[PDB]
Design a protein around this ligand. Structure first.
Ligand code: HEM
Length: 93
């Protein structure tokens, strides 16, 4: 997928709550590498890659994290998942 495209998807859809890779609503569940490994389903136990685990979360929602399946294309979701993985793993935030 395309992380650069994903930065645009993020700006349009995610930055209200996750500017800086943080979380304005639930402060512990950030988009940083340590928090993602602690909290994110699938990724947390090695059953999914970070990209796949983020795509699932984005598509389906959790708590006050909205579901974007049907609002964003599969491509956009894959791209934003690639973007988060890249930002987190590379400590770019
Ligand atoms: C498509 C844009 C978005 C993406 C890619 C995204 C991504 C994610 C990811 C990957 C997580 C898990 C973080 C972790 O486990 O440490 C998360 C959690 C969360 N996000 Fe988002 N997010 C988006 C939009 C939003 C928006 C707009 C809001 C605010 C209205 C929001 C609020 C939250 C909240 C509250 C959680 C924690 C949910 C919980 O487990 O209780 N997110 N998001």
């Amino acid at each position: 997928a395309d992380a650069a495209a994903g930065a645009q998807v993020f700006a349009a859809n995610c930055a209200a709550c996750h500017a800086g890779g943080n979380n304005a609503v639930m402060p512990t569940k950030t988009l940083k590498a340590d928090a993602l490994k602690t909290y994110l389903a699938g990724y947390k136990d090695g059953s999914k890659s970070l990209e796949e685990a983020v795509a699932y979360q984005v598509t389906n929602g959790q708590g006050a994290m909205p579901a974007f399946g049907g609002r964003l294309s599969d491509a956009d979701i894959a791209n934003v998942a690639a973007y988060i993985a890249d930002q987190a793993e590379n400590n770019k935030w």
